[PDB]
Amino acid sequence: EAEQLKNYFSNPDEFQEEIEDLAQYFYISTAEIHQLFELIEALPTLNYKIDSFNKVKSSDKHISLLNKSLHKVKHKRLTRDLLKQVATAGTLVGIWLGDAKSPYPFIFDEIKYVFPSFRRNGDWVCVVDMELFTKYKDDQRNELLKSLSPYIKQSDYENFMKDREKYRFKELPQERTFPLRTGTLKRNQGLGTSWVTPGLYDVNLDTFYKRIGVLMEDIEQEVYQKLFNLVLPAAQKDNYYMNYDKDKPLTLKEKMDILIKLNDKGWSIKHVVDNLAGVSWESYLEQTLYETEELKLQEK
Amino acid sequence: EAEQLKNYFSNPDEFQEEIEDLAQYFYISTAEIHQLFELIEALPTLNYKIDSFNKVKSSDKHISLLNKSLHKVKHKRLTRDLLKQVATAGTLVGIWLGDAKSPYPFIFDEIKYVFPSFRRNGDWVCVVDMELFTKYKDDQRNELLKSLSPYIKQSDYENFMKDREKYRFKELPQERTFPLRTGTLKRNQGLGTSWVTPGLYDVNLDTFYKRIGVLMEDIEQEVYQKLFNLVLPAAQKDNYYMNYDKDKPLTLKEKMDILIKLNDKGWSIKHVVDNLAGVSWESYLEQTLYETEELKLQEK
Amino acid sequence: EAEQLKNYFSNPDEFQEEIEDLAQYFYISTAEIHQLFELIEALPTLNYKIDSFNKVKSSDKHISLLNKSLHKVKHKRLTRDLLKQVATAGTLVGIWLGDAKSPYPFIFDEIKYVFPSFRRNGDWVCVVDMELFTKYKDDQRNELLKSLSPYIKQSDYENFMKDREKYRFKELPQERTFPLRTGTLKRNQGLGTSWVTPGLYDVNLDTFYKRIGVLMEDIEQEVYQKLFNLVLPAAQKDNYYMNYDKDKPLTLKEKMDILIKLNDKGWSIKHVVDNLAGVSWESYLEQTLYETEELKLQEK
Amino acid sequence: EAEQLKNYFSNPDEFQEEIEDLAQYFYISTAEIHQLFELIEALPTLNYKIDSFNKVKSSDKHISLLNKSLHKVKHKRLTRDLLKQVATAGTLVGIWLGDAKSPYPFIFDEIKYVFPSFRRNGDWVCVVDMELFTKYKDDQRNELLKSLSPYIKQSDYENFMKDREKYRFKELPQERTFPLRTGTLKRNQGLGTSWVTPGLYDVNLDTFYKRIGVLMEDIEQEVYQKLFNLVLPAAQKDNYYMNYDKDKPLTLKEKMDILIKLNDKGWSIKHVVDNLAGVSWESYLEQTLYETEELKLQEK
């Protein structure tokens, strides 16, 4: 029994299959790990902000475009899934597939065949192994290869079959792919580790907030930065950047005080009436105009 | 005994029937799970806000229309049912059936025959298996098929009977169907899991708030966004979006303070006297007018 | 012994008679369930509001009419009875019998013969079985059938007797009937369950408030919405809606502070003097006028 | 021993005699039930207010008339007796006997012969059984029948004796009789239950306040509403309504602050001096006038 765990810990970058199996098994057959993973996926409030390294003339247009493109992708769910999966396996390789104007994400599931391998220019490089395709159905294989058409093609698989030991690995574009990792001490370590390994043999809140803050920063600077680059013109590359909040936010009372303080002489009133439970904005304005325009209460 | 639970946990995506049976059984035969599900259905306040990514000239009309369309569907009950059900099974497939102007929802019961299967363009695709219809009564089968007339038709069932291994699956529209899921680690995992599995072998409040907040976000961006798209014209597609509140709201005292502060010199008084127990608005205004107009108390 | 409870929990939608019998028995023979049900009936304060999706020209008339029609039905007692009964059985079917102008409610007792059965247009449909009438006395049966004259008639019972297996079920109008249910996980589940089932084998306050809040919302949007539709003209259908308060209200001190703050320069004084123990309003005004008009104390 | 209690709980609507006997016995032979009943009769502060659904021209006259008619009946004692008796038996049937101008109440003591039986128009109907009169003395029987002259008459008893199985039940006018009940889960249940049944086998404060609040509301809308209708003209039927307070009132300090705040420039001074211990109002005014008029202290 013990020897199995010892061997698994001997090579955390090779015995990944068993680690994932036990992780998924104890996710449902135990509560501690279940609470761990739902805490990972839940604790973040995912309030975000996009800022710039320069103030261009037409900035507001870029801000609106970035907000819209962040909604279209529906980021919050993607961030939560990425956090849960990286915590599960310790490493992950995604990519933006759709066209530049309206990109859509794609998350590889098998790490044994797609992973980061080395670095160049200080940035990771991820190589897809073509052996992955030996198991997918012919129709499914053709569909997938059509999915990555401009980057990978059926010709690549045919060449691989021609010489399995020559074209066994293919590089992915830097501007799209993103590898995420966690649990690596060395900056030159490829495969991370899963958070289940420590407590596996057994079968604070601000500490976890700070632990997930680094993952949020990594997702900001690896995933959504490339999206901003894709959506915006070439001139505005790396000019804008997105940040998530890692600390506990200020509650409703202080927010309401700040908003009501702001309103005085000009600033928006809608968001003032907005945070009040009930008291819908349109009902508020309609009844107010009825009372001030029709009845003329203030004259009586 | 133990082997049965071990096997159930081995394949959470195949042994769903027994999991649902045990979930429903312990809902009534025990209090812990009953409290769990009542807490899921009860804790949310379901105070909501629809906002826009742009300020159109006729915005107020859209806001009023969306509020009305949210009431007609009577959303709160639907949201509570969806939460309880997805927690029960871990996955759910609904669809907007009625016409675009006045849609009405429909929730499938058998996950084994209707489920999400894969993704395209980054979005889930749900395929209805026609074997489902092999058990319904002929009259009931015809009625149900007439229910989904434009999307599914009796001709599809006839073709399925002609070749059971060719037309065994049918796709549903993206603008209408919505799959919801919970308990999936990998972004490419279809079937979630039920919250009963962890504590099954056995037979904080802010943590649950945050756990259910993600469910509210998912239901916002999956269910009601499509409704907004249906109700509003094409030009305003995905322009508006609705958000539910996940944190504990500010109590009545602060609400009253903000409202009375707002009233000064112009803003509505109806919502001021409204929150006072008793003291109905009409009685208040009527007696005030009686005292100031007829008796002229302030002149004496 | 245990087998009986196991069988009862096996089919909560079939063994309802025994469940209700045990519920009523332990209501009086034990204090826990008695406290439970008295808490359901007592905790709500039943302060209510009526608001509109539009501000019509003659709104005040509609507000007054709705308040009067809410009093005539004497809603509070009806709401408490409905809550207690639905908690007792888990389901309930009522209807508005009297004419539209001054309707009066009617609550069926036998769920086994009157229940919701299926859905159409997203709304439940309740079917009355005619076998119910096989037990009532001929005079009583005729009286009851006269009660539901426009919707059900003696001709229906005669047809049922002609062919017991053809006219066995009858539909009720949507604008009048209302089914209420509780304890159902699946949105397509007809019969709820009683709150006694969990603790039956054995023989927080804000949690109960929130649990009863959902029932209050259900009664608001299912029971009294139809009443509002009946009383108001066709043009104002679904325009007005009623809401009960679910949280703990602000105490008397803050209420009096708000009222006195309001009174300044014009607003009603009657409710200010009203909430003071003793100090009847008419005595207050009469003595004030006596002192300021005859004695002229302020001149001495 | 146990079988007797089990049988009593089997038919709470039939074994009422023994329940009342044990209730009255343990009222004096035990302290718990004694505290229960004195708490019921004592806790309410019976501060009341009459409000209107409309503001008629001569409202003040109606307010004064209603206050006077509430004092003449000496409501507080009647309310306390009604609460104690309904708690004792679970049901009660009263009626207004005297003429409309100055009505006086009458509370039947036997429930086995006078009770509510069914409903019509949504309102309970109470039927007096004439068997009740078989025990009263001939002189006493004639006196009682003269008491209810316009409603019941000796002719009714003679007809009953003529055919005991035909005229065995007589209806009472709706505008006068009032049935009160408690302990009924079903809206179609006639006989309530006594509060002694739960703890009988054995031999918070805000919870009891809320429990008695519903009884106070029932007494308001069943007993005194009919009185208001009787006293006021036909045009003002159901226009006015009376409400008792169920929460703990604001203490003397806040009341005094509110009154002294009100007094400024015109409002009554008598109630200001009134709540001060000692310092009788007439002594206060007399000594004040002596000091300001005779001695002229303020000039010295």
Closest Cα in chain A to C56: A290
Neighbours of D181 (CB within 10 A): 21
Query: Which residues make Cβ contacts (< 8 Å) with residue A145, sequence separation at least 6?
Result: A133, A152, A153, A154, A157
Closest Cα in chain B to D53: B283
Mutate to test the interface with B, among C248, C268, C271, C286 (most CBs of B within 10 A): C268
The token duo for A255 is: 């927010």
Phi and psi at residue C255, in whole multiples of 5°? -60, -45
The beta-carbon contacts of B127-134 under 8 Å, at least 24 apart in sequence, are B127/B169, B127/B170, B127/B171, B127/B172, B128/B152, B128/B169, B128/B170, B128/B172, B129/B168, B129/B169, B130/B156, B130/B157, B130/B160, B130/B167, B130/B168, B130/B169, B130/B170, B131/B168, B133/B157
Does C67 contact chain B (CB < 8 Å)? yes
Euclidean distance between CA atoms D10 and A258, whole angstroms: 63
Does D117 contact chain C (CB < 8 Å)? no
- Identity of the residue numbered C73: V
Euclidean distance between CA atoms A31 and A29, whole angstroms: 7
- In this complex, do A88 and B49 lie within 8 Å of one another by their Cβ atoms? no
Phi and psi at residue D172, in whole multiples of 5°? -110, 150
Partners of residue C124 on adjacent β-strands: C119
Both ends of chain C: CA-CA distance in Å?
87
- Is B143:B103 a contact under the CB 8 Å cutoff? no
Distance between C53 CA and the closest CA of chain A, angstroms: 7
The token duo for B64 is: 């009023």
Return the half-sphere exposure (C-beta side, CA atoms, 13 A cut-off) of residue A64. 9
Query: Which residues make Cβ contacts (< 8 Å) with residue C126, sequence separation at least 6?
Result: C93, C114, C115, C116, C117, C171, C172, C177, C179
The token duo for B7 is: 């096997």
The token duo for B166 is: 């060719």
Euclidean distance between CA atoms C294 and A164, whole angstroms: 115
**Residue C91 in 3-state DSSP?**
strand
Mutate to test the interface with D, among B286, B288, B293, B299 (most CBs of D within 10 A): B286
Which helix or strand (DSSP H or E) is residue B120 part of? strand B114-120
Phi and psi at residue B285, in whole multiples of 5°? -65, -40
- Is D229:D103 a contact under the CB 8 Å cutoff? no
Q: Hey, CA dihedral for D267, D269, D271, D277, is it positive or negative?
A: positive
- Is A217:A58 a contact under the CB 8 Å cutoff? no
Distance between B241 CA and the closest CA of chain C, angstroms: 19
- Is D45:D75 a contact under the CB 8 Å cutoff? no
The experimental method, as deposited, was cryo-EM
Partners of residue C179 on adjacent β-strands: C93
Contacts of A286 in chain C (CB under 8 A): 54-55
Q: Pairing between strand C169-171 and D123-129?
A: unpaired
Q: Nearest-5° angle of CA A280, CA A285, CA A288?
A: 120
- Cα–Cα nearest to A105, from A224, A283, A256, A250: A224
Distance between B9 CA and the closest CA of chain A, angstroms: 7
- Cα–Cα nearest to D94, from D183, D153, D175, D2: D175
Contacts of B270 in chain A (CB under 8 A): 287, 291
- Size of chain A in residues: 300
Contacts of B290 in chain D (CB under 8 A): 55, 59
Distance between B126 CA and the closest CA of chain C, angstroms: 20
The residue behind tokens 């806790």 is D43
- Cα–Cα nearest to B258, from C262, A251, A275: A275
Which subunits count as partners of chain C given 3+ CB pairs below 8 Å?
A: A, B, D
The residue behind tokens 């899991």 is B193
Q: What is C176-189 written as a DSSP string? A: T-EEEE-S--STT-
- Identity of the residue numbered A58: S
Euclidean distance between CA atoms C71 and D64, whole angstroms: 23
The token duo for B195 is: 């919250």
The residue behind tokens 């009604």 is D82
Euclidean distance between CA atoms D300 and D279, whole angstroms: 25
Euclidean distance between CA atoms C291 and C295, whole angstroms: 5
Mutate to test the interface with C, among B204, B276, B290 (most CBs of C within 10 A): B276
Longest CA pairwise span in chain C (Å): 93
- Strands (DSSP E) contained in chain C are 48-52, 91-96, 105-107, 114-120, 123-129, 169-171, 178-181, 240-244
- Identity of the residue numbered A22: L
Contacts of B85 in chain C (CB under 8 A): 185-187
- Is B185:A27 a contact under the CB 8 Å cutoff? yes
Euclidean distance between CA atoms D270 and B181, whole angstroms: 70
Closest Cα in chain A to B55: A64
Closest Cα in chain B to A33: B198
Euclidean distance between CA atoms B256 and B277, whole angstroms: 12
- In this complex, do C53 and B71 lie within 8 Å of one another by their Cβ atoms? yes
The token duo for C169 is: 């079920």
- Is D22:D16 a contact under the CB 8 Å cutoff? no
Euclidean distance between CA atoms C212 and C208, whole angstroms: 6
Neighbours of C74 (CB within 10 A): 16
- Cα–Cα nearest to B85, from B13, B15, B24: B24
Residues 277-296 of A with CB under 8 A from C: 278, 283, 286-287, 290
Q: Pairing between strand A178-181 and A169-171?
A: unpaired
Nearest CB partner across the interface for C284, out of D123, D210, D268: D268
The residue behind tokens 């000239």 is B57
Which subunits count as partners of chain A given 3+ CB pairs below 8 Å?
A: B, C
- Is B212:B23 a contact under the CB 8 Å cutoff? no
Euclidean distance between CA atoms B29 and C8, whole angstroms: 10
- Is D252:D275 a contact under the CB 8 Å cutoff? yes
DSSP state of B266: T
Which helix or strand (DSSP H or E) is residue B118 part of? strand B114-120
Phi and psi at residue C187, in whole multiples of 5°? -60, -20
- Is B211:B39 a contact under the CB 8 Å cutoff? no
- Cα–Cα nearest to B60, from C63, A275, A65, A284: A284
The token duo for C260 is: 């006195």
- Cα–Cα nearest to A273, from A287, A289, A265, A284: A284
Euclidean distance between CA atoms D31 and B13, whole angstroms: 62
- In this complex, do A290 and C266 lie within 8 Å of one another by their Cβ atoms? no
- Cα–Cα nearest to B111, from B176, B11, B181, B158: B181
Q: Hey, CA dihedral for A277, A282, A287, A292, is it positive or negative?
A: positive
DSSP state of A215: H
Euclidean distance between CA atoms B125 and B116, whole angstroms: 5
- In this complex, do D121 and C98 lie within 8 Å of one another by their Cβ atoms? yes
Q: Nearest-5° angle of CA C282, CA C284, CA C287?
A: 100
The token duo for A224 is: 């959504």
Does C13 contact chain D (CB < 8 Å)? no
**Residue B137 in 3-state DSSP?**
coil
Contacts of C257 in chain B (CB under 8 A): none
C76 alpha-carbon distance from chain centroid: 7
The token duo for B55 is: 């300020």
Nearest CB partner across the interface for C51, out of A283, A290, A300: A283
Chains B and D are in contact, defined as 3 or more C-beta pairs closer than 8 angstroms? yes
DSSP state of B221: I
Euclidean distance between CA atoms B23 and B29, whole angstroms: 10
Does A47 contact chain B (CB < 8 Å)? no
Contacts of B34 in chain C (CB under 8 A): 198
Euclidean distance between CA atoms C127 and C177, whole angstroms: 10
Resolution of the solved structure (Å): 3.3
Closest Cα in chain A to C245: A278
Q: What is A32-94 written as a DSSP string? A: HHHHHHHHHHHS----EEEEESS--TTHHHHHHHHHHHHHHHTHHHHHHHHHHHHHHHSEEEE
* Pairs of residues, one from chain B and one from chain C, whose beta carbons lie less than 8 Å apart: 124
Nearest CB partner across the interface for D51, out of B283, B290, B300: B283
The token duo for B186 is: 């990998």
- In this complex, do A286 and C59 lie within 8 Å of one another by their Cβ atoms? no
- In this complex, do D55 and B300 lie within 8 Å of one another by their Cβ atoms? no
- Is A218:A180 a contact under the CB 8 Å cutoff? yes
- Is A243:A220 a contact under the CB 8 Å cutoff? yes
Neighbours of A37 (CB within 10 A): 19
Mutate to test the interface with B, among D47, D49, D55 (most CBs of B within 10 A): D55
Distance between C175 CA and the closest CA of chain D, angstroms: 18
The beta-carbon contacts of B155-158 under 8 Å, at least 24 apart in sequence, are B156/B130, B157/B130, B157/B133
Partners of residue B127 on adjacent β-strands: B115, B171
Euclidean distance between CA atoms B24 and D265, whole angstroms: 69
DSSP state of A112: T
Query: Which residues make Cβ contacts (< 8 Å) with residue A161, sequence separation at least 6?
Result: none
The beta-carbon contacts of A212-219 under 8 Å, at least 24 apart in sequence, are A212/A40, A212/A43, A212/A44, A212/A83, A212/A246, A213/A246, A215/A83, A215/A86, A215/A180, A215/A182, A216/A44, A216/A79, A216/A244, A216/A246, A217/A243, A217/A244, A217/A246, A218/A180, A219/A79, A219/A82, A219/A83, A219/A180, A219/A244
Residues 216-275 of B with CB under 8 A from A: 217-218, 221, 238, 241, 247, 249-250, 254-255, 258-259, 261-262, 266-271
Neighbours of D102 (CB within 10 A): 11
- Size of chain D in residues: 300
Does D150 contact chain B (CB < 8 Å)? no
- Is B5:B200 a contact under the CB 8 Å cutoff? yes
Q: Which residues of C281-300 are buried (b: 16+ CB within 10 A; e: fewer)?
A: bbbbbebbeebbeeeeeeee
Which helix or strand (DSSP H or E) is residue B284 part of? helix B281-289
- In this complex, do A274 and B49 lie within 8 Å of one another by their Cβ atoms? yes
Does A300 contact chain C (CB < 8 Å)? yes
Partners of residue C95 on adjacent β-strands: C106
